Design a protein around this ligand. Sequence first.
Ligand SMILES: [Zn+2]
Length: 420
Amino acid sequence: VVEDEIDQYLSKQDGKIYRSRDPQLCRHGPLGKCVHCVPLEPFDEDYLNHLEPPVKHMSFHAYIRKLTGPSAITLNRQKYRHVDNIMFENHTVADRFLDFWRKTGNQHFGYLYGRYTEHKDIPLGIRAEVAAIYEPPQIGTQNSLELLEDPKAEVVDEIAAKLGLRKVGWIFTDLVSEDTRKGTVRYSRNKDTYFLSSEECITAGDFQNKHPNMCRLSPDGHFGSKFVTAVATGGPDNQVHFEGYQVSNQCMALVRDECLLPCKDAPELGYAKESQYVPDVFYKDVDKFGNEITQLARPLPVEYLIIDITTTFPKDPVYTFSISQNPFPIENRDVLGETQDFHSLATYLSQNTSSVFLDTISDFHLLLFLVTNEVMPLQDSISLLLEAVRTRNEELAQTWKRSEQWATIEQLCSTVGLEA
Ligand SMILES: [Zn+2]
């Protein structure tokens, strides 16, 4: 069992925070060390709590480094994170997703496709970089999501893999218009209600189980997960905002063992099973007193299962894929009269005659269509082009353009247009 390349980068990296002397509060020669200059552990809560913004979960690698280099379950608020930040490459990746809710008024589901990189801001921290959002077959309503069967689910995964990408998590909307003059949205998820349902916590835990973090220090070989979960809801300003979560490892275990239950008409709480024997399950809560009040997890406020993860839009944006003024359409959107077929591609390619062909072709959703469409599936000769995209290799793109297979895509579009 072999860890991710980022977990192999991280384990071979010094996590400390070094300091030369400080001017006023150091009491020794230029060479000596003392409690005020000796380096800082990547798990020291003092350092983290006093950052801006104050961090309250150490990095996972900061945690196992902290560990000196049918009984009853008791849940504590978890002191470490698996992913430390979710960074959308750019606002366009996330706005085109919300486009589905703006058009239909139904909530919408996506899969975050991107990569795991270093998050240099936080000691040993991991960042999840979101580069595409795959929208699968699904039925949405005003007040509910439903996943449909995805025949292409793992052809998608195979294409993205040759793009440098993997599923880093999922996204859903919970968006409701507030003010229909101003164009605002309700601010429904806050301290006084909830940020993630018991419902959504169980499915979060399910996804995290189904997507385990490989780790050489576990007998299972699995431990934790890097599968983040992202919410699009109105914010305190009644504008759409994105919120990053994960669910505690303890909470993964409950869902794995089918012990976690939702509460009806109570999203902010969830049940724990009674009998299938169930070790009684507790949690070490926080009151007002400051007494470590232990309680029985029937009910359980979901907040003792949820892990905040910062969501960033970078000051300098990244473009794994290209921004068209009139982009190729996204999958599963015929509902809104916006379909992927050879008419679309024909007008897409005509619109981009004067463009760098690498930019024109560097679209995730286009690439899925090219490989999986049923008129002409380029399912086997796309490897060449997938690599031109992953690499921003313009010469490598220009040659594939001269392929037999691309020529016939092009005479297809040409006679589609010739029939118009
Ligand atoms: Zn000193």
